[PDB]
Amino acid sequence: QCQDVVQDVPNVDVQMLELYDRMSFKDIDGGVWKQGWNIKYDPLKYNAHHKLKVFVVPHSHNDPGWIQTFEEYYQHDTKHILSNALRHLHDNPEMKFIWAEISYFARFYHDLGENKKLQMKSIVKNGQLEFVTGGWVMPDEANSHWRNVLLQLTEGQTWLKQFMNVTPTASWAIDPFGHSPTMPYILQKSGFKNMLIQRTHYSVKKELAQQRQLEFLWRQIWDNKGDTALFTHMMPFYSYDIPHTCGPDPKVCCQFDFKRMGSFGLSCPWKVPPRTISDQNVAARSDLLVDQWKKKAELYRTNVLLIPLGDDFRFKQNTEWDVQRVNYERLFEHINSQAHFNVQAQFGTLQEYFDAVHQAERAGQAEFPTLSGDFFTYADRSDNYWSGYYTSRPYHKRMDRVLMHYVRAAEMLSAWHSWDGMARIEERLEQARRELSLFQHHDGITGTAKTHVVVDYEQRMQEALKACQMVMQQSVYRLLTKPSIYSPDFSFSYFTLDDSRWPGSGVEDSRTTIILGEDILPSKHVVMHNTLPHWREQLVDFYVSSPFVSVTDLANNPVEAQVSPVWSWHHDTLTKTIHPQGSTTKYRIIFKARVPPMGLATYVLTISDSKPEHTSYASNLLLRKNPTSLPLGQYPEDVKFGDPREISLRVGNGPTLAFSEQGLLKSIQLTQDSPHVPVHFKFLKYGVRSHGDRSGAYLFLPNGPASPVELGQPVVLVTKGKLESSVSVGLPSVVHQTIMRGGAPEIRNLVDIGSLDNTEIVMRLETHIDSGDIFYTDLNGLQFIKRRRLDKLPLQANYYPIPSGMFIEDANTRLTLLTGQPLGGSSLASGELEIMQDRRLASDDERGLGQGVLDNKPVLHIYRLVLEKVNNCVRPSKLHPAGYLTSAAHKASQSLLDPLDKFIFAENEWIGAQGQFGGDHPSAREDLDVSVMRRLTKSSAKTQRVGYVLHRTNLMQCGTPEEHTQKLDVCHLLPNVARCERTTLTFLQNLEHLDGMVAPEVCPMETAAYVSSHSS
Ligand SMILES: OC[C@@H]1[C@@H](O)[C@H](O)[C@@H](O)c2[nH]cc[n+]21
Ligand SMILES: [Zn+2]
């Protein structure tokens, strides 16, 4: 039934880890094709009965923000490109154009008059204007979470289906900085049949070109049977621009970019300008161009050749449309009429190219190789590896993950009901999805935009968060209020969200204190939401104005709680120390919330005049020389002081953690009986080269291995409680915190790199795990891929994206670090893991940004650290390219990315309040998630429709006996189901009408989408 994703090593022609191990990577001068070789072809290959079919595909790369904001580019460039494309395509029926970025197309098309909308639909319908991919953006593939790649894809394709009546099945990704197999995974489950990529390491292009393996069936690394495969075309040369798309010699190809003759302020760096095609030169020019084409064709297996014709923000001026079109028309007329070339050349679209390739394949002209793996880390030349952007602008990388979860929660919470249009739910959700989708752009989450553009993205995401909160709190008020009492004002704020980790302590004082007092308000309701489809317990904390607070559930059952002080860290410019201060006006209360699957649970906080029975108080110990007092208002336990010393802590029956006198982990003991396993946290710094190429937002070019941060004698704060303990230390640039709640610790770093120029701060873990040169990192939060550190590559090439986690292991032991934000990282030596925290760079790195990275701001990075025994786990064989998390590590990742949401009732009395929502929801097996729940219909639809994306991961089997769990049938989550359909992941096509209206669960590592229809 399900394929085994662990025990069967797929047989593929190209496996990228294996290729990397055998490949040389030497950077030799290949001639005019600087990174290749002098291509030779047999003139007799093509003849009257076997012609080269050439598709020249005009395109325009439109960054939705980069050096200018989205709106700046729309006004200065893109609106003119699309307006002129409409006119020129309309007037020139054989001309063609492809378009990828639906954010801009939707921005344009809603400003069009109906006349022009009709003209636009007609050039789309007749095939002249073709959408490729059709996502909101062309997303980053390194840092983006798969859920947000799907979100943006769905945003763009839903728009296209509604307004243009088309759904692309060919993808175009010419600019992400390296490529991930998460894309063919999502695309193939979204109806796609073909995809194109460009930015892969120059050594890989050379190696695959030599074997004519640039077109391949790209399957997932665990996929033995190949049902995930998607036909992929990799472009062979250094750029998607015209000099690097006609053939191997850019000095020749630049002469066929007719925008470079001078009046457009562009030129050919190879010093030979384009010449206008005329009758007198067209034979000569045609000979030059066809020779480039036939050389490019030698790198591919069919007689169908793709020639992209475009560059950034091209096809803007009317004169530009004319100069490209007319000159190419003159070339085509001559070439196609001269039999000796045995070429038929024409403007085409991407789908036309792929259709002809597969016609050639079906006619037995070619068979394509199979490939698995990824295309990280990219280098475009020499040792210039693009691993910098795995970390650049980490504040916004973390914000991406926060907004990711708020969008899911807002869509899910509001999906349970139909809402009147006056509630503006659909409007607020559309804004939130679109701002998050825009940020998936390969200059958004990547941290490669200009400072003012990063500010625009942040402002947009802030508005999106506000939109999510609004939707979420209205939905909680409706879900938990007795129906005949529910009396909404859709503008009102019934609850506010409390988020302990965003923007996070010492990032902003954006947390509300619940103010209670005998003379004002005795108690407060709080509500937790659990977006995950299983019952979940999680400690939650709130700020309260008294330490004397007790917690009850909504059967008035006491709930055990712990109160701790509110500590904030300060750089004391007087004492020249980083040290904590305790609030004397507010306190933290912590308790375990238990919440139904996809549900809500209400608790009550009540003040009392003295210590409540079921509330305990943490002790606090400040370790530093020369201490001074730390009063804590009414907090009942006095702070203790001591000189720095090693300390050990244990919460519950969980691990025992030992810390150095500088407050950093040194060992973990899993059980009373077990060994203290060395696990040492260390902070180090990388610098920048004084000679040669400089690191910048894209590139990581360290001046050698990292050097330890000089820590001096830092102040360490130990808080010990029954429910939660922690060790926090004020290091230079980092307030580092280890938090213990009874299982794997949580690490929080408040990272403020300040004015440390040309510095990259890394967090490293040092262990005795005999990992050798192997480690594992995830791709887009979806899968873990085996990495091998290669000493034939420089340090920065051994850096990979860490979008959600990484691990190392040996036969017996594994250490897994889960992240709440994408960052760059590696294992640079056996037993080590490391992950970059922030980077501040004074210089530009020659990739077009025209600035360094000097706009850092404090960011709270969050992690879970899971040390496990794995000798009993059933793991893949040594040759398998994948790895898989354990249950504990997967749950720890979920605790970071989709924590409980916390709501505080905003007024004094909630009348009609209810205790729980969702208690009858099925509690699904732990490896299954409802990644998306989205109502797809507005309230006036007679047939309501709700879409669900179901993802099952694959967890390692390590001998924990399985317990029965309930089957989750998403189609019966809402009443009056009238139909259940399996759909593509965008919900845009029905694939199966399901028996009994039951949505089956999915196999490990698969993702499916279902839509339930309900009579209303
Ligand atoms: O070098 C990479 C940068 C990218 O950041 C932009 O997305 C891309 O469109 C572009 N054009 C020129 C230079 N660049
Ligand atoms: Zn771009």
From Swiss-Prot:
Q: CDD domains under this entry?
A: GH38N_AMII_GMII_SfManIII_like
Q: Which residues form a coiled coil?
A: none
Enzyme class comes to hydrolase
Give GO terms: molecular function aspect only.
alpha-mannosidase activity; carbohydrate binding; mannosidase activity; mannosyl-oligosaccharide 1,3-1,6-alpha-mannosidase activity; metal ion binding
Give the catalysed reaction(s), semicolon-separated. Answer: N(4)-{beta-D-GlcNAc-(1->2)-alpha-D-Man-(1->3)-[alpha-D-Man-(1->3)-[alpha-D-Man-(1->6)]-alpha-D-Man-(1->6)]-beta-D-Man-(1->4)-beta-D-GlcNAc-(1->4)-beta-D-GlcNAc}-L-asparaginyl-[protein] + 2 H2O = 2 alpha-D-mannopyranose + an N(4)-{beta-D-GlcNAc-(1->2)-alpha-D-Man-(1->3)-[alpha-D-Man-(1->6)]-beta-D-Man-(1->4)-beta-D-GlcNAc-(1->4)-beta-D-GlcNAc}-L-asparaginyl-[protein]
Q: How does it sit in the membrane?
A: Single-pass type II membrane protein
Q: Which UniProt keywords apply?
A: Disulfide bond, Glycosidase, Golgi apparatus, Hydrolase, Membrane, Metal-binding, Signal-anchor, Transmembrane, Transmembrane helix, Zinc
Assembly, in brief, is: Homodimer; disulfide-linked.
Name this polypeptide is given: Alpha-mannosidase 2
